[PDB]
């Protein structure tokens, strides 16, 4: 495992998650901040609203 939280920073499930542009993985339930993934805001909205067949995954469901 690599923790049930964003491993790319020391932040956690805190109340600030609204502007942290968080996203849930699609084959595991871990949540991650998209800002730590170096993703732009529009880039985030696209890969977050991609179809249910194809989409981006967390650092343990795929290497990035």
């Amino acid at each position: 495992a690599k923790g049930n939280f964003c491993p790319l920073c020391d932040k956690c499930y805190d109340d600030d998650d609204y502007e942290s542009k968080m996203m849930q993985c699609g084959k595991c339930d871990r949540w991650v901040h998209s800002k730590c993934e170096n993703l732009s805001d529009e880039m985030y909205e696209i890969l977050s609203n991609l179809p249910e067949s194809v989409a981006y995954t967390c650092v343990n469901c795929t290497e990035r």
Partner: protein, 117 residues
């Protein structure tokens, strides 16, 4: 060559083989100018992309050179396609993507608009 707008944000890529990864998109897109981000979405059962991906430049002019030259480029033995991806900023907080290049991403999932609600 030509384009609908120069833009300064991320751009679209397609016609890729499943063997393509960010290291292939970086080496093929870096000669026009500096890149700052590349990501490939994947299919949940095979961990492969359907031949579509995204790229982001550090400069707005070099992104216009990508759509002007890489749209005729070739990778893995097949032709690729490149175009802008700024005129598709999602209307999150009001509706899902159904009105732009993001709509054809839904048509790509398999029509889907016959059940949109």
């Amino acid at each position: 060559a030509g384009h609908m707008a120069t833009t300064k944000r991320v751009l679209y890529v397609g016609g890729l083989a499943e063997e393509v990864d960010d290291k292939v998109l970086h080496a093929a897109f870096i000669p026009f100018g500096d890149i700052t981000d590349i990501q490939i979405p994947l299919d949940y059962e095979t961990e492969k992309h359907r031949g579509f991906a995204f790229v982001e430049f550090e400069l707005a002019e070099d992104a216009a050179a990508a759509i002007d030259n890489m749209n005729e480029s070739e990778l893995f033995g097949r032709t690729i396609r490149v175009n802008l991806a700024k005129p598709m900023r999602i209307k999150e907080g009001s509706s899902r993507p159904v009105w732009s290049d993001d709509d054809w991403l839904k048509k790509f999932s398999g029509k889907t608009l016959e059940e949109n609600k």
